[PDB]
Amino acid sequence: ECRVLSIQSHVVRGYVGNRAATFPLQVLGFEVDAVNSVQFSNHTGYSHWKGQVLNSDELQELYDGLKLNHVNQYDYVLTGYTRDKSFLAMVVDIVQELKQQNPRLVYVCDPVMGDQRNGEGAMYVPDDLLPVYREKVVPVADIITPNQFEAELLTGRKIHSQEEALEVMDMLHSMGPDTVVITSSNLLSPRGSDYLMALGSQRTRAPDGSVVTQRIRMEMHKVDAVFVGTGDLFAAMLLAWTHKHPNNLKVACEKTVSAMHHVLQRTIKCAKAKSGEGVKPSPAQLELRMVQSKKDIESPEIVVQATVL
Amino acid sequence: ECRVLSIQSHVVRGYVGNRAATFPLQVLGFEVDAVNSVQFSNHTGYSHWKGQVLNSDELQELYDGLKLNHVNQYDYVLTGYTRDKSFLAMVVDIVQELKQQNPRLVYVCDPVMGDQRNGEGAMYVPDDLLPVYREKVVPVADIITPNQFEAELLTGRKIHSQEEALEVMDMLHSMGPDTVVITSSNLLSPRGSDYLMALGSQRTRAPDGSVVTQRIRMEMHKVDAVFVGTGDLFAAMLLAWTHKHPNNLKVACEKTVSAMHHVLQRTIKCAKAKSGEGVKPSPAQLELRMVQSKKDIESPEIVVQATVL
Ligand SMILES: Nc1ncnc2c1ncn2[C@@H]1O[C@H](COP(=O)(O)OP(=O)(O)CP(=O)(O)O)[C@@H](O)[C@H]1O
Ligand SMILES: Nc1ncnc2c1ncn2[C@@H]1O[C@H](COP(=O)(O)OP(=O)(O)CP(=O)(O)O)[C@@H](O)[C@H]1O
Ligand SMILES: Cc1ncc(CO)c(CN)c1O
Ligand SMILES: Cc1ncc(CO)c(CN)c1O
Ligand SMILES: [K+]
Ligand SMILES: [K+]
Ligand SMILES: [Zn+2]
Ligand SMILES: [Zn+2]
């Protein structure tokens, strides 16, 4: 009984968008209904790319489809990278109707807007999207996973310290989502530039109306390469694991990251093993070795440690 | 090193076409590049259905895509149900260019045209397709899996006996494919109406230019229900297994069928378990329990026996 309505992009080759969130969620037993928001030959990181996009009407046509056949009832709804403002809107209407359809509907949303680097950040999607995510989308999500950049954008506040971070996540919680995980930061991790720091924070409702707030910090070993898709693979698995541990933003993230590691490490290798001695791996060689990593996606060898508060 | 270019239909919900051939081929480690020939909400067997189709030009646009990025090199190419004559054509041009690209390119083709029943058969695709499959498509395929009906149509000859069958398969081999498996027949199996007979035949080239021809017969236990997708799931796995046993149309089919059984039996059950005591299962309940059957798709418990000649 695990149905997910993943609305994301599809590529014929490679792993990005729905191609990066389906296989996982399936080997881990989730019945994944996937709506391809676009179908391109490969991700836009390649030199060339040809494909088509689904517009707001078309997306609609499909929703209705599932309606007419009374099968528009899901547990989780997962979304990520979108370029059309109008499209994203539609997606909200849907998630809405869909929630009245099932109270315990968890909307896992990766507010994809852009990347940063010490301040030198910038959106890679139209700016007319920031308003929707902030005003329409985020308000209804129940689990968001933004960048440092992305979280800074939504909150309109820049992060300088870890404490400021935890306070930017609180501003998020006060936006709707009871789960917020800043998948990666520029903050120097207490273990050196070699690592990558990530921050998580979950809000639970106390039996007396009070507040309970767990917080964590996982430092992952960085990998020297430009990877396309990790944003999607992460959100998927997080959704998976946070289902097994409905109340352990700590336990989940641990598994979620560990696998991310296993995948990336096997990826970079096979990738490097195809350009050995003197050449930078092409984006066509850095694609995620998903299939080859199934073994880990299911039985993740926890090789990280969540630190509370 | 297992890349497949599966050109088939996609549904948001359910398992038919590419949704029925991808998950399998992946859990069994094949890097599957999937081109969705159409994207509908659910298969056309439901009361309603809404969706869009990819035309010949659009399909082209994607091929080129993989071209410009020099990644148009696959091992296997898998196709099935197509409704557009023009579309199928395109698909041949591609498979062609693609074969010059890699000699050992195996084109696995399921010549989907229609179903039969003692003679009362009829195509469920435009008749303007029979000519292409017979003249253009089949000539280039290296592994076809037709119906009794479908094989009768291609050969233009009706099957009455088992011997006539083996002779209809020979007429196929003489069309191109060195592998032909009539996935199911009306021929009474030597074990009663309760079973389903299927026939396989592989042509190998002898080291002296002579002829070697293995032949088999597997009787599978029938299941009392109308299942959509089994045609696709079969072709996938056959492609999988006939890769491990490049020369044992016997060994392969055994595994291919066994799993088909496991899937169908678990499917019918969960399906029946949702309409218990007095109601016929809806097509919305008969969908294939794919995810739930991964365990078998990989470790198929051989519960059948291939009979040579
Ligand atoms: N070069 C790298 N080294 C280590 N981990 C990396 C990595 N690239 C990605 N990751 C992993 O991917 C996850 C999310 O990555 P990140 O926070 O960079 O994504 P993002 O939101 O910028 C996504 P994208 O840019 O791909 O859309 C983290 O768990 C992180 O460990
Ligand atoms: N009702 C049933 N009972 C037993 N096996 C069945 C079945 N329906 C399908 N199968 C299995 O599916 C495989 C192919 O089925 P079949 O020959 O009926 O397909 P087909 O080419 O008519 C496909 P479709 O009509 O679904 O496109 C066989 O291996 C067969 O065992
Ligand atoms: C088409 C497409 N989809 C999804 C992503 C990332 O989630 C990328 C890479 N920007 C992409 O090019
Ligand atoms: C859209 C679609 N694709 C594929 C198939 C069978 O391979 C069906 C069922 N006819 C279907 O409706
Ligand atoms: K993120
Ligand atoms: K068939
Ligand atoms: Zn991202
Ligand atoms: Zn068929």
UniProtKB/Swiss-Prot annotation, chains A, B:
Its cofactor is Zn(2+); Mg(2+). Its EC number is 2.7.1.35. Pathway: Cofactor metabolism; pyridoxal 5'-phosphate salvage; pyridoxal 5'-phosphate from pyridoxal: step 1/1; Cofactor metabolism; pyridoxal 5'-phosphate salvage; pyridoxine 5'-phosphate from pyridoxine: step 1/1; Cofactor metabolism; pyridoxal 5'-phosphate salvage; pyridoxamine 5'-phosphate from pyridoxamine: step 1/1. The active site is at 232 (proton acceptor). Transmembrane segments: none annotated. One of its GO terms (biological process) is pyridoxal 5'-phosphate salvage. K(+) binds at residues 110, 145, 183. Activated by K(+). Activity is increased in the presence of Na(+). ATP binds at residues 147, 183-184, 220-223, 230-231. Keywords: Acetylation, ATP-binding, Cytoplasm, Kinase, Magnesium, Metal-binding, Nucleotide-binding, Phosphoprotein, Potassium, Sodium, Transferase. It is found in: Cytoplasm, Cytosol. The modification Phosphoserine is found at residues 56, 161, 210, 282. GO terms for cellular component: cytosol. ADP binds at residues 147, 183-184, 220-223, 230-231. GO terms for molecular function: ATP binding; metal ion binding; pyridoxal kinase activity. Belongs to the pyridoxine kinase family. PANTHER family: PYRIDOXAL KINASE. This is Pyridoxal kinase. It comes from Ovis aries.
